[PDB]
Design a binder for this molecule. Structure first.
Ligand SMILES: N#Cc1ccc2c(Oc3ccccc3OCCn3ccc(=O)[nH]c3=O)cccc2c1
Ligand SMILES: [Mg+2]
Ligand SMILES: [Mg+2]
Lengths: 542, 402
């Protein structure tokens, strides 16, 4: 079976072929391996070879509990073989598929064995079936199963094979995934079956068999963790385990399944569980479950109680994205064309820092959605967002970092994204000026936070088990606690200055959160910085 | 052209493997058209699975026609074999010309061609991408101007003979032509060079003024009435500049604030403090001592957003030593955004850097990674691409370089 051209293959430079010996396993499977190898010899898939290849790869035979399968271990050869263009990893997302009147699934059997292997490379595929006294030598003429080059070379071969058929049939759309072909068309059912038959025979001319019966797979289709119905898609049912104790492995699989659920079931929250997964220690140990994680999990269970589906994609209809706040640090989004019919859903939980605010997270969510949309639909969607032009404009104008804000429309669906507070850009007249400082002995971890004001008020609060940074935040917090609704605060800490000027409404540290509550309760707050250890109102202490 | 220049990679190093970035349907369409035509013209050829290598490609508008830009940064890093005039920056006018098309006249070393492999991506992973490699010298590859160098010398020789005072420097796909001539004369000579290039079969389908380029002097505020907050800002800024300029003193200025005063309190400048401030204004006029360019070290460009369409930048090698500083501005017209201005600024800084040192700086970009990676090709008109990374550095930086 020459007509398929062979891809040239080389070993890695400086490397020879595998000499690894056959491991007996003198068990009766020998004869099995004979029978199979005779059949494959009849079909020209393999060949007996002269006494000097010289090379070897281990061959095995088994039946998992009637048939017998030959399994060759190509690991050593695979390490010694050149890389090939990476075979398809990413799969088409169901939400990106365009609805077709008829869809057929074609599994080609013995896919790899139907494609010839490069002649000069065949000697390296040699294997031995053991004689009882000590054997018969064989080599592959086709792409072996388990070999490094098989998927990419078969992929290429299949593409080239498919070109002439697709050329004369532009109205039918063919997806190629591994061995499978998925063939859609809008043609009448009869002539669709006809076109399928044509494709089948065309493939048969290249030595590729397709399902002979009325094709083995019927709607719906279980494919890569999905259910594909003619009019809709969804995910295969997600079963969340119930345990008293959880290891880090269990939590990884849990957040995995939940992540998988998030693309369709709206409202999924993974954050607190991955917070549990912040421990990287090798995956054995029992990880303590936090109340927040338990709550999160329970809510997820309540969401997964109801059945949910997505729809398929129409290029003529607009692409629309909508975003809602899920509570602390967490967001959820829906992508749809028809208003209540979701193409898909998702989430954004990421802080990407110890502190952030709502608008920043929203903008990041928009970014993630944009990327995903480009990947799946090859275009960016329209955004319906729960934020007002004034809010966002003020934010991105006063934001030091460059940002891209799309065309969007304000939808009013509380909670609305808002600025909980805004620091003053100018010092406040009539407001008390707090000169703050804090310090800690790095050895003893003991510290203090204090202020002196222009009204003549001075205070010092003692602190235990703390650092200079935390004390410098502590001082600011202290000045917030003891002042009126309007306050001027002066600090020598670049750290604290950086944290507050960023205007976070949420944080990992409870100290910063307290500071945020204070800032919200305030009306006017101005933060100013001065260089430390120069003549200044606030002075210094130890 | 039949004789190919053999090209090698630095010992113990393989070809580039780099992820192709997802693209919109439009850009993919454009790339498919372009690559179809290029394949018909023999410039590129389809390749099989036996080629592991990949290089990113993008579609940019540079006219209405789509252009294909290949990002060769990795291949450029991994492949080197083999001058910059110092007078180019002194010239009154410098014009840039795209000579890249010429590279398509020269075939590429066969054994090396596989390292030029690139992929036109598919939407939603419907198909594996369309894979090509280059049969000729690709634009953006640093081997191209090196191999074409003798031809370029041959073509330019008569012109240089005719115009001895005109400077011509080549970087990548670009010719930089400086002159001290009057603008009209300059553009006339430029056009002469253009037609000279065209009639010899070199296709050339942006003028600077490096004479005006300078390192920004630090500017101190001028006020009729000074508050405590103002003098605090002043002292902080002068303290920052004190590292760079040794003579600066804050004592008399800080004396006015000496303790426990309200921020909004108006503080008059005493003649001593005003003396100190004036002296500091005077020392800020002179350039910094001991700042020299090192060709063996990476150039580094930091940018910060000043708002209202203003952006400031610094080019340095080692911290606090500034080879150049500048400020870029754009008239908004309500069309503009942050990404556009940042991209433009990056291109301008890179051009300035090429003109002055003959190399591109490593950029520290005040933007989110994914946002830049998404939108940067929209406004990018340049044939080359700089290295870049992404940082914030807000806290004291905006106010000081403002
Ligand atoms: N197993 C399996 C399997 C089956 C079909 C796939 C596929 O099916 C398609 C193949 C070609 C063209 C359109 C396709 O689907 C569009 C959406 N759709 C999907 C399923 C259905 O019944 N009807 C329908 O209109 C597209 C992509 C992957 C597929 C995997
Ligand atoms: Mg299959
Ligand atoms: Mg301090």
């Amino acid at each position: 079976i020459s007509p398929i051209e062979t891809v040239p293959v080389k070993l890695k430079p400086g490397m020879d072929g595998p000499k690894v010996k056959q491991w007996p396993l003198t068990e009766e499977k020998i004869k099995a391996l004979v029978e199979i190898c005779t059949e494959m010899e009849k079909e020209g898939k393999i060949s007996k070879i002269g006494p000097e290849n010289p090379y070897n790869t281990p061959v095995f035979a088994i039946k998992k509990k009637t048939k017998w399968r030959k399994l060759v271990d190509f690991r050593e050869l695979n390490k010694r073989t050149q890389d090939f263009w990476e075979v398809q990893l990413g799969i088409p997302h169901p939400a990106g598929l365009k609805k077709k009147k008829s869809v057929t699934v074609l599994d080609v059997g013995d896919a790899y064995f139907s494609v010839p292997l490069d002649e000069d490379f065949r000697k390296y595929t040699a294997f031995t079936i053991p004689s009882i006294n000590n054997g018969i030598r064989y080599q592959y003429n086709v792409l072996p199963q388990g070999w490094k080059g098989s998927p990419a070379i078969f992929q290429s071969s299949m593409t080239k094979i498919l070109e002439p058929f697709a050329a004369q049939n532009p109205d039918i759309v063919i997806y190629q995934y591994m061995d499978d072909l998925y063939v859609g068309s809008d043609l009448e059912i009869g002539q669709h079956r006809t076109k399928i038959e044509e494709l089948r025979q065309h493939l048969l001319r290249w030595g590729l068999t397709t399902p002979d019966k009325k094709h083995q797979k019927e709607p719906p289709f279980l494919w890569m963790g999905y259910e594909l119905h003619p009019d809709k898609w969804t995910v295969q049912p997600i079963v969340l385990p119930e345990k008293d104790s959880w290891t880090v492995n269990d939590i990884q699989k849990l957040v995995g399944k939940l992540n998988w659920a998030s693309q369709i079931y709206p409202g999924i929250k993974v954050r607190q569980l991955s917070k549990l997964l912040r421990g990287t220690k090798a995956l054995t140990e029992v990880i303590p479950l936090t109340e927040e994680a338990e709550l999160e999990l329970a809510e997820n269970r309540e969401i997964l109680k109801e059945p949910v589906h997505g729809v398929y994609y129409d290029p003529s209809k607009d692409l629309i994205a909508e975003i809602q706040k899920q509570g602390q640090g967490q967001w959820t989004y829906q992508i749809y064309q028809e208003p209540f019919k979701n193409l898909k859903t998702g989430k954004y939980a990421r802080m990407r820092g110890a502190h952030t605010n709502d608008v920043k997270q929203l903008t990041e969510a928009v970014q993630k959605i944009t990327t995903e949309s480009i990947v799946i639909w090859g275009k960016t969607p329209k955004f319906k967002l729960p934020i007002q032009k004034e809010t966002w404009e003020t934010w991105w104008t006063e934001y030091w970092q460059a940002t891209w804000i799309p065309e969007w429309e304000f939808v009013n669906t509380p909670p609305l994204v808002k600025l909980w507070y805004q620091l003053e850009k100018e010092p406040i007249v009539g407001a008390e000026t707090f000169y703050v400082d804090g310090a800690a002995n790095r050895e003893t971890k003991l510290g203090k936070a204090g202020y002196v004001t222009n009204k003549g008020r001075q205070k010092v609060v003692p602190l235990t088990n703390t650092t200079n940074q935390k004390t410098e935040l502590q001082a600011i917090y202290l000045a917030l606690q003891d002042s009126g609704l309007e306050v001027n605060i002066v600090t020598d800490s670049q750290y604290a200055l950086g944290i507050i000027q960023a205007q976070p409404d949420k944080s990992e540290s409870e100290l910063v959160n307290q500071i945020i509550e204070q800032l919200i309760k305030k009306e006017k707050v101005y933060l100013a910085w001065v260089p430390a250890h120069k003549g200044i109102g606030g002075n210094e202490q130890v | 052209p039949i004789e190919t220049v053999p090209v090698k990679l630095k010992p113990g190093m393989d070809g580039p493997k780099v992820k192709q970035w997802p693209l919109t349907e439009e850009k993919i369409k454009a790339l498919v058209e372009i690559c179809t035509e290029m394949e018909k013209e023999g410039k590129i050829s389809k390749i099989g699975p036996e080629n592991p290598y990949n290089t990113p490609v993008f579609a940019i508008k540079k006219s209405t026609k789509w252009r294909k830009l290949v990002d060769f940064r990795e291949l450029n890093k991994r492949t080197q074999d083999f001058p910059h005039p110092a007078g180019l920056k002194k010239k009154k006018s410098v014009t840039v010309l795209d000579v890249g098309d010429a590279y398509f006249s020269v075939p590429l070393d066969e054994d090396f061609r596989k390292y030029t492999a690139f992929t036109i991506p598919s939407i939603n992973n419907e198909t594996p991408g369309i894979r090509y490699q280059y049969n000729v010298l690709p634009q953006g590859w640093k081997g191209s101007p090196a191999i074409f160098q003798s031809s370029m010398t041959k073509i330019l020789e008569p012109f240089k003979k005719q115009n001895p005072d005109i400077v011509i420097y080549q970087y990548m796909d670009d010719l930089y032509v400086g002159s001290d001539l009057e603008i009209g004369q300059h553009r006339t000579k430029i056009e002469e060079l253009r037609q000279h290039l065209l009639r010899w079969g070199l296709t050339t389908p942006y003028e600077l003024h490096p004479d005006k380029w300078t390192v920004q002097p630090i500017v101190l505020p001028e006020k009729d009435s000074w508050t405590v907050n103002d003098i605090q800002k002043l002292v902080g800024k002068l303290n920052w500049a004190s590292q760079i300029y040794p003579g600066i003193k804050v004592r008399q200025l800080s004396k006015l604030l000496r303790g426990t005063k309200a921020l909004t309190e108006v503080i008059p400048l005493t003649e001593e403090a005003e003396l100190e401030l004036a002296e500091n204004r005077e020392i800020l006029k002179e350039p910094v001592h001991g700042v020299y360019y090192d060709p063996s070290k990476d150039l580094i460009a930091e940018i910060q957003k000043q708002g209202q369409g203003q952006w400031t930048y610094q080019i340095y090698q080692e911290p606090f030593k500034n080879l150049k500083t500048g400020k870029y501005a754009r008239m908004r017209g309500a069309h503009t955004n942050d990404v556009k201005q940042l991209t433009e600024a990056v291109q301008k800084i890179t051009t300035e850097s090429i003109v002055i040192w003959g190399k591109t700086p490593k950029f520290k970009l005040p933007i989110q990674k994914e946002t830049w990676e998404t939108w940067w090709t929209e406004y990018w008109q340049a044939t080359w691409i700089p290295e870049w990374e992404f940082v914030n550095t807000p806290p004291l930086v905006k106010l000081w370089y403002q």
